[PDB]
Design a protein around this ligand. Structure first.
Ligand SMILES: *[C@]1(=O)[C]([C][C][C][N]C([N])=[N])[N]C(=O)[C]2[C][C][C]N2C(=O)[C]([N][C]=O)[C][N]C(=O)/[C]=[C]/[C]([C]C2=[C][C]=C([O])[C]=[C]2)[N]C(=O)[C]([C]C2=[C][C]=[C][C]=[C]2)[N]C1=O
Length: 223
């Protein structure tokens, strides 16, 4: 997260870290044993880390659970990152408490101008390389589709939305992928991609979760 702030320990209880010897992607806990993340973060043998704040120091509050199965969306396209979403079933159900809790799926899509909270352990520099120990947060609005389409000509699908600042300065970045974009208490997006980080007229692009609620529920009810 570039231009964000320290969230505060366990203030974003649904945020999870996807670890494979190191943090590589984020994710969101939507059920005691299901987390949603980006399809492009797919890896075999993923250990999900819940109740995490400082990813580099064991603070005793966290839970480490291996992924039982990863289900990538049937129409995921690596060439365009369209349908960049995947469900991960946990090997064991998480102990939901105050420091660990699931986030609700949306009932309708969020409009442009809606303020959301984006979080993750990704790079904090536009140019440099600096990964934070503690979780970073950022408040950013959902941008209009026209603005999104003009920033990324011919690259935006109906399953993506832009969020952030058109003048740059604040944005998600490498390492935030798969992470949550929560608006008014509902998970509306998943960190997907962008051209650089925090660049003028190059806002972050996120998977539009509201288009996959039926798929998510059905997948959970049959797996
Ligand atoms: C995600 O954390 C990022 C989020 C970027 C948000 N940016 C923003 N809001 N402005 N997503 C990406 O990097 C996506 C997926 C792949 C292509 N993406 C892009 O945004 C690219 N855009 C234009 O070129 C730029 N991305 C990169 O170059 C990312 C490179 C690194 C290193 C790397 C890893 C695997 C490769 O095959 C090539 C290069 N990738 C990351 O940092 C990943 C996390 C990761 C994945 C696998 C192993 C290790 C780390 N970050 C994300 O996917």
């Amino acid at each position: 997260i570039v231009g964000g702030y320290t969230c505060g320990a366990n203030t974003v209880p649904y945020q999870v870290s996807l670890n494979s010897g190191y943090h590589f992607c984020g994710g969101s806990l939507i059920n005691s044993q299901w987390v949603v993340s980006a399809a492009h973060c797919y890896k075999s043998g993923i250990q999900v880390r819940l109740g995490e704040d400082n990813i580099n120091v064991v603070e005793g509050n966290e839970q480490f659970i291996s992924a039982s199965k990863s289900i990538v969306h049937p129409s995921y396209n690596s060439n365009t990152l369209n349908n960049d979403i995947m469900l991960i079933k946990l090997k064991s159900a998480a102990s939901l408490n105050s420091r660990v809790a699931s986030i609700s799926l949306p009932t309708s899509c969020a409009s442009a101008g809606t303020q959301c909270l984006i979080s993750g352990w990704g790079n904090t520099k536009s140019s440099g390389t600096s990964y934070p120990d503690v979780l970073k947060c950022l408040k950013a609005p959902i941008l209009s589709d026209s603005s999104c389409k003009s920033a990324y000509p011919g690259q935006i699908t109906s399953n993506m939305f832009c969020a952030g600042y058109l003048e740059g300065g604040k944005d998600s970045c490498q390492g935030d992928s798969g992470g949550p974009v929560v608006c008014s208490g509902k998970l509306q997006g998943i960190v997907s991609w962008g051209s650089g980080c925090a660049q003028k007229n190059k806002p972050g692009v996120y998977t539009k979760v509201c288009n996959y609620v039926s798929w998510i529920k059905q997948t959970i009810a049959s797996n």
